Amino acid sequence: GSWSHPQFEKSGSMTRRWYLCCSRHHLDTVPEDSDGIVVPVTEHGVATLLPRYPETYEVEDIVDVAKDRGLSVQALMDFTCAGCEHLSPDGYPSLRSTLDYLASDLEVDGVVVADPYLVEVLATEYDLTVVVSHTAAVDTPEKAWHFERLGADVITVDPALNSNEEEVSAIRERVSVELRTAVGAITFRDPVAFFERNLFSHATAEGIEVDPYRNNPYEPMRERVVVWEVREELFDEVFILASGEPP
Amino acid sequence: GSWSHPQFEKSGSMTRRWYLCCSRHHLDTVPEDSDGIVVPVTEHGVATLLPRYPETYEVEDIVDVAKDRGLSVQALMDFTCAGCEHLSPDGYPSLRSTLDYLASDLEVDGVVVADPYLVEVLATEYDLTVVVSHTAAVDTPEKAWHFERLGADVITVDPALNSNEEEVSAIRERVSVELRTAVGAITFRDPVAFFERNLFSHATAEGIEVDPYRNNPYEPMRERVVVWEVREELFDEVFILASGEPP
Ligand SMILES: [Zn+2]
């Protein structure tokens, strides 16, 4: 009620499940009972290594239909490098313009980021869920604590910790944020992932194609260290990247 | 001799010591018995975080005088990100032009790099010492083995290992390269170093100034995790970054 209309009314720890969605068609495969989807906002910079990245008109279609189906929506904007953007006076207005787009145009519920500066700006100036991506390689209590202090609401651990009770427990002892695990994700223990994710961060942001067989120098270098196993009971949230056939 | 001039003539495990040199004046403080200096080649991209970076005309002066004094010389070109350079057809010729400059104009003895692609090109096409920088964050036998396979001659461990006999030993069991330790360097365990080194990699390469008090967003975030302690007996080479007052 209200002060002139008095009213008396009377009357969450299940694992929350998020699915990557890279296309309008991919959305149809998300399980009906899922809590939300994570959608790459390609042109703003994505470090996560994917089979395909949606164009802006696709993102907007995905988000509309997902909300119709009652799914929460997070934007994946987890670039690990933005070049010299932060050094120019234009950098801050450009960043705020991008976050306004996410918050007020797309109207996402949260944002999955890696860059500590974005964590800080999002937490300070917006009212979105701030999720630290696994591409930030948070693998220690110390790293988790600093991301919490900058304003993270949720921290995705590096996938190397996905079955590690001792190390996840050490992080829980230190921070109060929710912890997420990414399934089908590459661990920073991979010898070249750091560099390859920097490359895709720029490719997506700048609209420069990366073709696995033509111009990615990291593609022939190794078998990527993907982590498929997980102990879900250690985590508050599960984020499924690869669910089946690639989009 | 030679086949027509027959000749009979008759008749190294001490720790090798390298010093960072950021200016012509800094060179005068290098100990006389040092094995070599490491000089940032700023305009080609440096991730190591320094008080000052020499301009190209300074680099050439430093290298000349260092050779006069019988010091070996390595170029520090350890950027962790080159943006989209590798994606364009121009990228490979640009890279070879840069390495030709190091090999044939400056005539350095070696190059300290982070990018796995540069390791591979340097080892395949040139006859320089290929040193993996501590900014590549090699902290495991697995990571060391992949950099060796790509062609590293020397691997600088992540500074978190500088006093860790067990972990350095595990790396030695796996690889045959020389191992270097960096003293006065930041460990990748630092919560934001990854991102800050990406930023400086671009700033130096692109000639965009970074002022600690005006436009580095990572500067106010934390006390950097610098490693000062070392167990030199674990390493083949010692690289001193900070020797005294900053250049
Ligand atoms: Zn970059």
DSSP of B140-175 = SHHHHHHHHHHT-SEEEBPGGGTT-HHHHHHHHHH-
CB B46 within 8 A of CB B77: yes
Q: Which domain, by its residues, includes A118?
A: 1-247
Residue B37 CA, ligand 1 centroid: distance in Å: 27
Residue A87 CA, ligand 1 centroid: distance in Å: 13
Which chain B residues touch A122 with a CB distance below 8 Å? none
- Which value, in Å, is the radius of gyration of the alpha carbons in chain B? 18
Ion ligand 1: residue ranges with CB closer than 5 A: A 81, 83; B 81, 83
Resolution of the solved structure (Å): 1.7
CB B53 within 8 A of CB B208: no
Query: Could you tell me where the DSSP H helices lie in A91-240?
Result: 91-100, 116-125, 141-150, 165-174, 193-206
Breaks (C-N over 2.5 A) in chain B follow: 11
Residue A162 CA, ligand 1 centroid: distance in Å: 28
Q: In whole angstroms, what is the distance from residue B88 CA to residue B85 CA?
A: 6
CB B137 within 8 A of CB B188: yes
Those residues whose C-beta lies under 8 Å from the C-beta of residue B18, and which sit 6 or more positions away, are: B34, B35, B36, B37, B38, B74, B180, B237, B238, B239, B240
Neighbours of A56 (CB within 10 A): 13
**Half-sphere exposure of residue B59: CA atoms within 13 angstroms, side-chain side:** 23
> Residue A21 annotated as binding?
no
Angle at A25 between CA A20 and CA A30, to 5 degrees: 45
By Cβ distance, the residue of B115, B189, B218 closest to A195 is B115
- Hey, is the C-beta of A85 within 8 angstroms of any chain B C-beta? no
Report the gap between the CA of B108 and the closest CA in chain A (Å). 25
CB B20 within 8 A of CB B239: yes
Which chain B residues touch A114 with a CB distance below 8 Å? 195
Number of domains within chain A: 1
Q: In whole angstroms, what is the distance from residue A181 CA to residue A72 CA?
A: 18
Neighbours of B4 (CB within 10 A): 5
Please report the beta strands in chain B, taking only residues with DSSP state E, as ranges in sequence order. Answer: 16-20, 36-40, 72-76, 110-113, 129-132, 154-156, 178-183, 185-186, 226-227, 237-240
Tokens for A112, please give them.
């999955």
- Contact at CB, B215 and A87, closer than 8 angstroms: yes
Under DSSP, the state recorded for B123 is H
CB A152 within 8 A of CB A127: no
Closest CA to B136 of B160, B157, B118, B166: B157
Experimental technique, in short, is: X-ray
Those residues whose C-beta lies under 8 Å from the C-beta of residue A177, and which sit 6 or more positions away, are: A144, A147, A148, A152, A153, A154, A155
Q: Which amino acid is at B110?
A: G
